[PDB]
Amino acid sequence: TIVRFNRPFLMIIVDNFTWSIFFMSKVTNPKQ
Amino acid sequence: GLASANVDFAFSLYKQLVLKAPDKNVIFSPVSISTALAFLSLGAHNTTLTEILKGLKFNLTETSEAEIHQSFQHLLRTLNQSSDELQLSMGNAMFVKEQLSLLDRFTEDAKRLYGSEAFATDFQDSAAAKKLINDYVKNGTRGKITDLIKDLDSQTMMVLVNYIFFKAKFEMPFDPQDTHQSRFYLSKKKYVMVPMMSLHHLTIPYFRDEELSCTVVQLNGNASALFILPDQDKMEEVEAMLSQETLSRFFESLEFREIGELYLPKFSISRDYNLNDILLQLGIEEAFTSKADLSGITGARNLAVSQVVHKAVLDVFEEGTERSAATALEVLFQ
Numbered sequence: 001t002i003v004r005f006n007r008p009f010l011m012i013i014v015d016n017f018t019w020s021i022f023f024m025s026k027v028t029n030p031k032q
Numbered sequence: 033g034l035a036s037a038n039v040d041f042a043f044s045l046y047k048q049l050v051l052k053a054p055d056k057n058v059i060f061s062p063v064s065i066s067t068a069l070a071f072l073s074l075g076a077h078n079t080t081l082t083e084i085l086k087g088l089k090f091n092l093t094e095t096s097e098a099e100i101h102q103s104f105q106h107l108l109r110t111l112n113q114s115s116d117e118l119q120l121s122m123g124n125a126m127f128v129k130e131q132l133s134l135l136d137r138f139t140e141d142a143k144r145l146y147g148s149e150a151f152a153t154d155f156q157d158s159a160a161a162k163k164l165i166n167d168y169v170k171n172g173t174r175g176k177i178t179d180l181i182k183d184l185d186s187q188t189m190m191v192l193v194n195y196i197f198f199k200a201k202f203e204m205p206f207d208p209q210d211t212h213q214s215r216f217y218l219s220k221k222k223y224v225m226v227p228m229m230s231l232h233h234l235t236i237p238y239f240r241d242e243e244l245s246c247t248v249v250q251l252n253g254n255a256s257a258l259f260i261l262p263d264q265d266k267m268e269e270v271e272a273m274l275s276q277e278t279l280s281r282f283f284e285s286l287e288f289r290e291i292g293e294l295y296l297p298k299f300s301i302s303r304d305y306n307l308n309d310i311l312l313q314l315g316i317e318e319a320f321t322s323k324a325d326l327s328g329i330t331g332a333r334n335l336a337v338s339q340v341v342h343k344a345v346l347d348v349f350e351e352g353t354e355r356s357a358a359t360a361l362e363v364l365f366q
Contacts, residue, residue: 001238003249004295006228007217008267010260011346013198013355014279019035020107021042022255023198023355025346026050026058026267029218030226030299 033094034103039276040089041066048310050271055218059303059344061196061357063107064122068194068359069316070104071124071146072337073097075138075329080318087316105145110254111196118253119199123172124148127165127191129155138329148192155188165191169358173197176345176356180304189335189365195358203252206231206350211298220264227298229350238289239282246270248282249291257353258282259296298350304343311340322366338364 013023042062049058066088073084085092090100111122126142128134130152142148151168155161162181170178172195181191206229214228237250245266249259260282262270308320318324324336344357 001289001291002293002295003238003247003261003291004293005259005261005297006215006295007264008262010258010262010267010270012258012260012279014256014258015038015107015110016254016256018038018103018107019276019279020038021062022111022196023061023344023346023357024042024046024058025060025301026046026271027297027299027301028055028057028267029224030216030297030301031224032057032299032301 033091034100036276037089037091037095038062038066039279043274043276044089044314045310046274047271048313049305054268057301057303059301059346059357060305060342061344061355061359063111064194064196064344064357064359065307065340065342067104067108067122067124067146068192068340068361069311070100071142071148071192071194072319072326072361074101074141074145075135075326076319077325077328079323080325083316083318087311087314101141101145108147113253115253117201119197121172121195121197123195125151125168125193127151127153127161127168127193129153129189132189133330135329135331153191155184156186158184158186161188165193165360168193169195173345173356173358174199176347176354177343177358180341180343180358180360184362185338185364187364188338188362190329190363192361192363193358196356198355199352200252200257201352204231204234205352206296208350211350214295216297217264229296229298231294232292234291234294235288236291236294237286238291239285239287241282241285244270244273244278248286249294250286251296256283296348298348300345300347302343302345304341307340307342324366326363334366335363336366338362 339362
């Protein structure tokens, strides 16, 4: 199995207990 | 009940940020923004107050005002931690025109619940006031956010500020010897070369969602870092399914799996925003007009919000990640 982040992707940082979202990102172009 | 509010708020805001420019990178901290607005609500009354709390997606029939503030106080304490694996910090502050009289209940509540002090500030010396605030944010974010405040009205009465900083090591770091320039497909037909980190024979939580045409993994304390990788041209479809229900199914469906190869770019990105339009769309309206009731701050309805700004930065590298964000709420006299 290969997981290749070579296309747009999302990242979400979630508080386990409260589900507060501490940070969220969509990377459409890492060279910005 | 608080969990449903937090996710609804984060995803509502996310979609609103995307709508303004659907192909741009997005980076933001939902909790930085909600903490700043909840802090403001400590001084709000009547419709100004109810609009703020409803805009943060709380339902005031399940959760009382006191329970909301208690949740932010607890959250603030969970986001100040240090270990060999992690550095987390979160702070709040108020910068206030020196001669402005504040109610003792407000400054007591602000320190106890939000950890906020009050800094006497001469906003009429705009350059000096901006430096004072930007330096506070620079200090809290370890130099990662340094220009949160660009323009600042010389007639400002107060600025409420939140910052958050998060630095973490990967459980399994990438070897920089295995980072190589590789294609990143902005679309099927548009691609650039980026430094692409790689790891082999990894065992990590994994879920292939054939229904949503995406793969979810977790790399890495007590926070879960979810990576969601839509198939090519499926990002818009995945965004359309984001919700508490979908996030729950992701977490429920993860299972450990040996992955042959993992490729993740090395990169740093930044975004900044003015959130007035979005907050008005979420129904937080009276706070921006002359009907604003922030009389819990001063004892008179003599303040209203002028500007809400947010900036956030994300850095991903072989050893781990660094994330930072800050929010400022600028307040004028009325």
